[PDB]
Each structure stands twice: as structure tokens, then as C-alpha cells.
């Protein structure tokens, strides 16, 4: 009779039950306890300012209308039946387009206990918005948020809470990090209030703190640019009479800087301001530009004022390495210390 | 108290007809609109559209849904919207749109004792607006959103903005990577067709493009290459290898700049303001190398005349290039 017992309990719960009304409607506030497990913190797109995350979403609340007495204390609902009861209308405030997985079947589970408690779990992939400040690129760090709450019920009707301490209510898997250009440092868990044109709502928030890796840009952009500037100052040590040698030297280092500059801008997103990399390239471009102007001055004074032409070349061998060396000290202390 | 609500709600939906509008056969039903803009992104020049996410609310009064005895606003499960009458609102310039559905459909229905119905939706839409890019990147754009009723006329339904100019919120919190919103505007009007009038609401934004990216990536590199081409005029004319190499390498550098800019900028196949400046700089470096051809050809027979051409080139070229910039920037700023 165990099979008949289980069937009877299923066919009795939804008798006289209206799913258009939340539990405790007109009597009390519905409390929903939530916790999140993150299985993979997916790719971050700097172009679109968005990121992907895969989570198990768990919610828990009490519904007195679904109490029962029987040999067992927990019931699992078929997804056809799980669509007959009231569930919270949780949505992500900064979500762009999310996916609920149903392969090979809907990845939902709803458990009912005898006292009336409901446990509701689902598997989701969320694409959310992470606005970024790129003034310090590529030495920038960002906090990408994740906010969710009720779409229709105000805080006088539905409130959200974390199942445990807020720190321990969001758990990331050991192999969760799936980032190629960022380093996930940690997360902070909070809870706030938002006011709209329709009322006041409870918002649950999580922030993921990311720091960009800079080793790639040092070997790809900064080192080639520094070597090209050093090469342009090598021209000062060639003899003045080698006019074709020094003209070819200077004008080809300008084309080399132009090639490097165009390559670097492809990685950067289309931002209005100037990043930390934009300023470094512009200064390097002005340095190689000034080295060719210097030879034009030296060549002009040769054969008429050889003393002045020699004096200009000797001072350039000191001023140019000094000014560029000074610029790097200021540059790498202004941005590495933020 | 919950049993009394259960009885009252089931009373309203008993005998309710979805196929008949409120005040059917009488005065038109008035619908008030609110828009809460959440984010604007992906302003595409090639596709000539933009993507918008917003909260869209509609307010109207239906006497068949009036209830008494409960001093509350009844927020019902969003699946009850299929059991009621809702306006046939649509967006006239919408290319692609959808309603978010995680974890459930982002929809709201709220009832009030007097019969007022609040109906909310969270919508992401791609709307088409024409962009005139002849002055790119020094251009301003005006993109709109048009709201109209598909089937009814002004004898059945009417549209108005709920709250006046405050009906649309959230524009002041928008940040665009390449643009800056200057103003937004709300227009309400009727369209007089042959079959009668039709209500329409319109929301427009004016965008002003940012210039900082183009100054350091497009204009300044081209200006410096032009100046370097004038170094040839201060070199002695018998240094043929130095001046030819300097002249022809600046032509290659200018070509490299123009080709790669075409690769990175959006593909807009007609003449813009940016194409005129790059082409103008290319002509200047073309003429600087052409100047040495004349000097090299006559510096042996007429060495004094060849020296006078180089001295005048030191003045005419910098003066004519600033004259080109003055006319260009006045006509575009």
C-alpha cells in the first residue's frame, strides 16, 4: 500500500489551492532564503562590458497550504505539478540574456516537507553587465556585481535573506575561475534597497573583484616601444657626415613606432579618454619624432658652424636618455601604485 | 483574510470577457505610459540601430475589475495577465525585441480597488534610427522610439504620458563609451489616416560623439608625419639619397596610417569628414617629394634658382597646411 499512500498525498495537496496568491497574503511578509553555488566564473568581455556565470540557484520559503501527514517527510514534485504552486518571481537586475537549462530535461527540483517548507533549486547561466573604468588600462581592477530580487512584490510583501552568514552563502568551486586575462581575488556579499516608480524592493548583491594581468602587455607593447626609442637615440653616436645613414635611421624608426602603435590600439576598446597605454605610446612617438628633428638641426649647422653642430650632438647624448629615463620613473610610480 | 481574498479574486474573473475592451461601445479607454530606462548600449553605425533595455508600464482603468472590502493593492501571479484584456501596444521602429524570462517571465500585474490596472514588462529592444555620418566623427545623432496601437483608433483607445515630462526616467544615469546624451524629449500626437486618427507616443534622444579617441589615434599621427616631410627642405639639395629616402618613406608611413584606420573604423562606404583630412594630408606629403624632383633636375644648370625654391618651400608649405586646417576646422566645428 506504500505506492497508493504516495499517490494519495500527491492528489490531495493542490485541492483548494490558488497559485495566484502568495503564502500569507494579507497576513504576513513572505521570507525567502537564498544561497548560490558558482560552478564557473566564465569569460569577461571588455568590448561589451559583460561577463558570464554558471550557478546553482537555491530558494527556500514556507507555505502552510502544502502541509501533509504521512510515513515520509519529504516529497519531490513533477515539473508539471511544480508549475501549479506559487514560486518567487526572482530576476537579475543587471542581467542581459539568461538561460535556464533543460537538457535532457528541465534542471529544476522542488521538495516539500511535512511542515510546509519548500526547497527550490535550478541551474542557470547568466550574462550580466559589468561597467568598467579603463583610465588605468592595462593596470586596472574592477568589481563586477550581480543583483537579484523580486520583480513584482515590494518589501512590504516579500523579503529576501541569505541562508547562512552572507560570506558563506555564496560559494565558488575550486576550478571555478575560467578567466584568461583576469585574476579573481574574491567576492563580497551584501543586501540593499531600491526605490522605483512602482515601490520599494529588496535587492541582494554580490561583487566579484578582478585584477588584470599585465605580463602580456610588457612583452608585447612596452618592451618593443622602449627598444625602438633607445634605437632612435643610437643615431646620435653616428658621425655627422653620414647623412644618408642618419636620415634612413631616423625615418625608419618612425615607421617602426607607427606599426607598433597601430598594433596596440586593436586590443584597447573604443573609449573616449586616454588609458595609461595611450599616454605611454604618445610620449614614445614624440621622442622618436624629436630625434629626427635634432639631426635636421645638426645637419643645418654643419660646414658653417662645426663647433655648434658638435655641441648639439654631445648634449643630445645626455638629455635624451635622461628625459626618457625620468619619464619612465614617473610613469611606473603613478600607475603601479594605484 | 486570505480566504476572503481568494473568494473576491475568483469573483472578478467569473464571466470576464477578454475580447471586449473596457467601456466597450462607449468612451475610449485612456492608457498612461511610463518608461524606466535601465541601459543603452551597442550604438551601431553599420547596422544603424541601438539596443535598449527598459521597464515598460501601462496604466488604465477597467470597471469590471473593481473590488471593495480589501484596503490593499493586489499583486497577482504574472500568469494572470493572459486572463485579462491588455492594450495592443507595439513599437513601430523595433527590429528585434524580447521579454526576459529568468527565472520567470519578467511581467507584473497589479490591481487597485477603483479598477486601475498596472501592467509592467522588462523589454530589451533593438530599434532602427538613421544616422547621417557625413561629418563623422564630429557628428550628432537623433534616435527615437515610436509607440503605437496596432488595431484601435482614437475612438477606442488614447495614449498619454503619465507624469508629463517625468514619464521617462533613468537617462541621467546612462554612460555611453563613445557618445554623451545631450537631451531627451517626449511627444504625444495623433496620426490622421484615411480610416481615422491613431494615437502615438514618441521618445527621442540626441547624442554627441566624443573626440578624445580620434585626436590621439587619427589626427595627431597624420599631422606629425606631414611636419616630418618638411625636414627635407632644410637638407642640402645635393644630398639626393637622404632627401629621396626621407620623402618616399613618409609617403609609405602615411599610406600605412590610412589603410589601418580603414580596417579599424566602422565600414561606412561614403565620403565622411575623416576621409577628407587623411586625403588632404596625403596630398601634402606627395607634393613635398615632388618639390625635390624640380630642384634635383635644375640644381646643376641653375644652382641659384634651385636654392630659392627650397627657401620658399620652407614658408609656403607650413603656411598652406595651417590654411588647410583653418578651413577644415571652421567647416566642421
Amino acid at each position, epitope marked *: 500500500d506504500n505506492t497508493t499512500v504516495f499517490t494519495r498525498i500527491l492528489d490531495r495537496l493542490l485541492d483548494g489551492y490558488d497559485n495566484r496568491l502568495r503564502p500569507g497574503l494579507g497576513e504576513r511578509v513572505t521570507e525567502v532564503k537564498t544561497d548560490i553555488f558558482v560552478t564557473s566564473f566564465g569569460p569577461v568581455s571588455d568590448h561589451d562590458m559583460e561577463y558570464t556565470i554558471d550557478v546553482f540557484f537555491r530558494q527556500s520559503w514556507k507555505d502552510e497550504r502544502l502541509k501533509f501527514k504521512g510515513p515520509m517527510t519529504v516529497l519531490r514534485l513533477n515539473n508539471l505539478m511544480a508549475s501549479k504552486i506559487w514560486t518567487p518571481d526572482t530576476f537579475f537586475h543587471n542581467g542581459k540574456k539568461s538561460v535556464a537549462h533543460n537538457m535532457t530535461m528541465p534542471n529544476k527540483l522542488l521538495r516539500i516537507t511535512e511542515d510546509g517548507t519548500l526547497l527550490y533549486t535550478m541551474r542557470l547561466t547568466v550574462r550580466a553587465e559589468c561597467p568598467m573604468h579603463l583610465e588605468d588600462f592595462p593596470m586596472d581592477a574592477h568589481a563586477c556585481p550581480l*543583483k537579484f530580487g523580486s520583480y513584482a512584490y515590494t518589501r512590504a510583501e516579500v523579503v529576501y535573506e541569505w541562508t547562512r552568514e552572507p560570506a558563506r552563502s555564496v560559494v565558488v568551486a575550486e576550478d571555478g575561475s575560467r578567466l584568461n586575462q583576469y585574476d579573481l581575488l574574491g567576492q563580497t556579499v551584501d543586501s540593499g*534597497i531600491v526605490q522605483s516608480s512602482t515601490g520599494e524592493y529588496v535587492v541582494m548583491t554580490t561583487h566579484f573583484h578582478l585584477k588584470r594581468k599585465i605580463g602580456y602587455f610588457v612583452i608585447q607593447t612596452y618592451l618593443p616601444c622602449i627598444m625602438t626609442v633607445i634605437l632612435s637615440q643610437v643615431s646620435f653616436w653616428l658621425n655627422r657626415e653620414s647623412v644618408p645613414a642618419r636620415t634612413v635611421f631616423g625615418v625608419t624608426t618612425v615607421l617602426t613606432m607607427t606599426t607598433l602603435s597601430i598594433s596596440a590600439r586593436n586590443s584597447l576598446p573604443k573609449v573616449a579618454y586616454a588609458t595609461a597605454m595611450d599616454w605611454f605610446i604618445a610620449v614614445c612617438y614624440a621622442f622618436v619624432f624629436s630625434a629626427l628633428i635634432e639631426f635636421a638641426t645638426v645637419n643645418y649647422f654643419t660646414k658653417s658652424q662645426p663647433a655648434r653642430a658638435a655641441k648639439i650632438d654631445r648634449l643630445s647624448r645626455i638629455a635624451f636618455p635622461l628625459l626618457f629615463g625620468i619619464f619612465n620613473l614617473v610613469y611606473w610610480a603613478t600607475y603601479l601604485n594605484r | 483574510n486570505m480566504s476572503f481574498v481568494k473568494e473576491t479574486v475568483d469573483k472578478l474573473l467569473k464571466g470576464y470577457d477578454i475580447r471586449l475592451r473596457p467601456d466597450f461601445g462607449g468612451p475610449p479607454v485612456c492608457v498612461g505610459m511610463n518608461i524606466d530606462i535601465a541601459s543603452i548600449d551597442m550604438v551601431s553605425e553599420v547596422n544603424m540601430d541601438y539596443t535598449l533595455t527598459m521597464y515598460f508600464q501601462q496604466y488604465w482603468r477597467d470597471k469590471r475589475l473593481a473590488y471593495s472590502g480589501i484596503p490593499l493593492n493586489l499583486t497577482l501571479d504574472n500568469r494572470v495577465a493572459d486572463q485579462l484584456w491588455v492594450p495592443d501596444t507595439y513599437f513601430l521602429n523595433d527590429k528585434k525585441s524580447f521579454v526576459h524570462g529568468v527565472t520567470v517571465k519578467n511581467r507584473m500585474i497589479r490591481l487597485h480597488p477603483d479598477g486601475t490596472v498596472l501592467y509592467g514588462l522588462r523589454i530589451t529592444t533593438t530599434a532602427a534610427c538613421m544616422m547621417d555620418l557625413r561629418r563623422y566623427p564630429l557628428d550628432e545623432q537623433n534616435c527615437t522610439l515610436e509607440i503605437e496601437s496596432y488595431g484601435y483608433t482614437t475612438d477606442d483607445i488614447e495614449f498619454y504620458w503619465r507624469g508629463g515630462d517625468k514619464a521617462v526616467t533613468g537617462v*541621467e544615469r546612462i*554612460e555611453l563609451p563613445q557618445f554623451s546624451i545631450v537631451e531627451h524629449r517626449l511627444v504625444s500626437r495623433n496620426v490622421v489616416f484615411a480610416t481615422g486618427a491613431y494615437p502615438r507616443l514618441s521618445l527621442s534622444f540626441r547624442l554627441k560623439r566624443n573626440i578624445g579617441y580620434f585626436i590621439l589615434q587619427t589626427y595627431m599621427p597624420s599631422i606629425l608625419i606631414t611636419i616630418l616631410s618638411w625636414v627635407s627642405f632644410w637638407i642640402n639639395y645635393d644630398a639626393s639619397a637622404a632627401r629621396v629616402a626621407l620623402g618616399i618613406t613618409t609617403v609609405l608611413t602615411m599610406t600605412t596610417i590610412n589603410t589601418h584606420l580603414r580596417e579599424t573604423l566602422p565600414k561606412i562606404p561614403y565620403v565622411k569628414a575623416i576621409d577628407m583630412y587623411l586625403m588632404g594630408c596625403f596630398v601634402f606629403v606627395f607634393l613635398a617629394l615632388l618639390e625635390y624632383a624640380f630642384v634635383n633636375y635644375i640644381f646643376f644648370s641653375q644652382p641659384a634658382r634651385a636654392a630659392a625654391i627650397d627657401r620658399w618651400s620652407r614658408i609656403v608649405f607650413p603656411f598652406t597646411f595651417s590654411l588647410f586646417n583653418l578651413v577644415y576646422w571652421l567647416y566642421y566645428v
Partner: nanobody
Amino acid sequence: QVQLQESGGGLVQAGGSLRVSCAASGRTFTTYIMAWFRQAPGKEREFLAAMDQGRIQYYGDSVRGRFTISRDYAKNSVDLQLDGLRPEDTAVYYCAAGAGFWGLRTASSYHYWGQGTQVTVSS
């Protein structure tokens, strides 16, 4: 340059409204987090409230339900409505702006700070 100038303050008779403002200049903080802090004499600097770009409001566990924060995004400012003031609320109220890296409730994550404004409560 960027300066956070603060107004309001003064003295109140152990109650009443007291709206402390904060005006920013030299940079638009629409995409930043604007917060308020409090430092009692010699004790510690304490977090009070914060509002992000999405208008989400965060409050400290001691001032929840008494102090209300708001932002006027057009004028690039932030306000804090102080109601039901008590003698323990006598301190220097600070205005801060930041990106909230590693936590919006920690003072060490805000780039810009105000010059302060003494608020005195007399009982």
C-alpha cells in the same frame, strides 16, 4: 581638479531634520559609488550609507531606518537626510566617491574624500 565640498551641519536640539549635502566638481561621478562616513572623536571612522549607479541603497546596521541617502545625478551631488538625531551622532560626517573595489563598506577603497563637516547634537 576634483573636490568634494560638503555643506549643511550645525547644531540641532536632539532631534529634527538635518540634510547634509555634498557637491562634486571636476569629474562626473555618475558611474561611481558615492557614500557617507562618520568619525566620532577619537573612536573610529564608520560607514553610514552608499548609493551606486543602479540606485541601490546600502546602510550601516546602526543607522538603518533613520538616515536616508539620495543622489541628484544631473547636478552630480549626494545628500543624507538625518532624522531623530542623538548625542551619539555628534561627529564629523565625510563624503567619499569610489569604485568599491574589495568592498564598498571599507573606507580604504574610495579615491576621493571630502573635507568634512562637523555635526553637533545637544541634549
